[PDB]
């Protein structure tokens, strides 16, 4: 099957944790992914390796890792690739409990027009 | 008139400033705000007070400040508010070259369903 692992930055302040939880809850409401887990980059648990361990624990063979980050940075271009064990020539390979699970690392949000939409909603106090 | 100031984190690595550049270009394309500028909180210029300097320079009486941040944090709840000289109520009282300029500080993006849409788009490589 296929899992979605959402990945966000650590903050010491709890706002980002709630952000990731609620995002995972809404993507769960769309019922397109059997397993949806969350992972925090720093400070707070779960840690991202925990997200992957639990995604496989419920039975996933392909773990889609989505950087829940506006722009690229050190975290998305260096930290997360190394935490998940991605590298050159190959995309991703995890070998656990007699199971070969593949990882696919996705892109940040970027300058999507929907961010613009939200920006303008906010500008008008909405 | 009223200006829009987009506000970003800023990084020694350049992705965030270019993100803000592109977002400001798209909202300019939307032709809802007469003046649109961006401001970086750290490392990179232009800066938030500099953004305000130029927003007033082109002629603003009302400064719409939007935090281009996923969740709340120290920058959005403490740092950036003090950089602007606001504290909670209304936010705005600024006085330059014979001008009473208002700032209105908006809220972060949050767990908008449109971030969910983008997340899923990314998950499928879209």
Swiss-Prot record, chains A, B:
Gene3D superfamilies: 3.40.50.1400. The active site is at 9 (proton acceptor). Its EC number is 4.99.1.3, 4.99.1.11. GO terms for molecular function: cobalt ion binding; nickel cation binding; sirohydrochlorin cobaltochelatase activity. Keywords: Cobalamin biosynthesis, Cobalt, Lyase, Metal-binding, Methanogenesis, Nickel. Ni(2+) binds at residues 9, 75. It comes from the Archaea. It catalyses: Co-sirohydrochlorin + 2 H(+) = sirohydrochlorin + Co(2+); Ni-sirohydrochlorin + 2 H(+) = sirohydrochlorin + Ni(2+). Pathway: Cofactor biosynthesis; adenosylcobalamin biosynthesis; cob(II)yrinate a,c-diamide from sirohydrochlorin (anaerobic route): step 1/10. Coiled coil: none annotated. Substrate binds at residues 45, 70-75. Co(2+) binds at residues 9, 75. GO terms for biological process: anaerobic cobalamin biosynthetic process; methanogenesis. Catalyzes the insertion of Co(2+) into sirohydrochlorin as part of the anaerobic pathway to cobalamin biosynthesis. Involved in the biosynthesis of the unique nickel-containing tetrapyrrole coenzyme F430, the prosthetic group of methyl-coenzyme M reductase (MCR), which plays a key role in methanogenesis and anaerobic methane oxidation. Catalyzes the insertion of Ni(2+) into sirohydrochlorin to yield Ni-sirohydrochlorin. Homotetramer; dimer of dimers. Belongs to the CbiX family. CbiXS subfamily. This is Sirohydrochlorin cobaltochelatase. It comes from Methanocaldococcus jannaschii (strain ATCC 43067 / DSM 2661 / JAL-1 / JCM 10045 / NBRC 100440).
């Amino acid at each position: 099957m296929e899992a979605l692992v959402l990945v966000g930055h650590g903050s010491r302040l709890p706002y980002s944790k709630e952000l990731l939880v609620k995002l995972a809850e809404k993507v769960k409401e769309r019922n397109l992914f059997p397993i949806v887990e969350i992972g925090l980059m720093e400070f707070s648990e779960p840690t991202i390796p925990q997200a992957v361990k639990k995604a496989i624990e419920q039975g996933a063979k392909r773990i889609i890792v989505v950087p829940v980050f506006l722009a690229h940075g050190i975290h998305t271009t260096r930290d997360i690739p190394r935490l998940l064990g991605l590298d050159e020539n190959g995309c991703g390979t995890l070998e656990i409990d007699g199971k070969t699970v593949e990882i696919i690392y996705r892109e940040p949000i970027g300058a999507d027009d929907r961010i613009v939409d939200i920006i303008i909603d906010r500008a008008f106090g909405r």
